[PDB]
Amino acid sequence: SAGGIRRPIQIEEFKTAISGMSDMELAQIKTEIENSINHLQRSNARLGKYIAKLEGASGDLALYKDSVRENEIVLNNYNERVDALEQETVYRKTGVDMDNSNVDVVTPNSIFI
């Protein structure tokens, strides 16, 4: 699918495209993005080790730092795209009177005549 393609996509164009799809297509995209999220989080775990190893000891440290900084920008797009999946999902679970006040029967005419 064109949604969740391992690179960051603009949200407003996703927020429209998500509307005109089938429910099984949304579940396929939702599965695809979560796999993309686990791919970056296991990537950031590996980048986290090479930070903590060299932080224990400044060339080839800033290049690790903007690599994990860049992954947070792409990951910020993923959970924003997952947030649009949640909002599209929740839109599809909505779609005696003795006073002569009423009838003035003191008068001969009021009865029915």
């Binding site: 690179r7 960051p8 996509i9 603009q10 860049e70 947070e72 797009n77």
Partner: protein, 128 residues
């Protein structure tokens, strides 16, 4: 081009962080300054930084950037909350309606200003 003007062309980061090769215009030179100062910041540091450099940013948008600050009447910096319904409607026509071609640039912008005038009627009328 990743650092400074090279032949009057720089690189510039998109909404998605894709590099774009733009001509380093005064707007683009302002764009690049915001990429290095504001947009690179994490989510918790974003809002306080805007409230500190408030008057700076607005001044630069009205002078340099192709999308100016909305809440400016007669070249005085205001906020949307500190405008009149009148001043907004005047400002809307000033940017969305073209004096040279005597037409709304896009029909959607007419609709937008139209709905806002309806909203004004809706707010102020007493009876139906």
């Amino acid at each position: 081009t990743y650092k400074k003007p090279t032949g009057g062309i720089v690189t510039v980061r998109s909404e998605m962080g894709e590099p774009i090769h733009k001509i380093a215009t005064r707007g683009v030179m302002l764009w690049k300054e915001f990429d290095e100062t504001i947009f690179n910041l994490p989510k918790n540091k974003l809002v306080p930084t805007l409230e500190a450099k408030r008057d700076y940013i607005i001044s630069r948008l009205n002078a340099d950037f192709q999308k100016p600050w909305f809440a400016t009447v007669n070249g005085q910096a205001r906020d949307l909350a500190t405008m009149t319904y009148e001043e907004v409607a005047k400002r809307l026509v000033e940017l969305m309606f073209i004096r040279s071609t005597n037409s709304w640039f896009d029909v959607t912008w007419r609709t937008f200003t139209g709905d806002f005038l309806r909203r004004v009627e809706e707010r102020f009328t007493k009876s139906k």
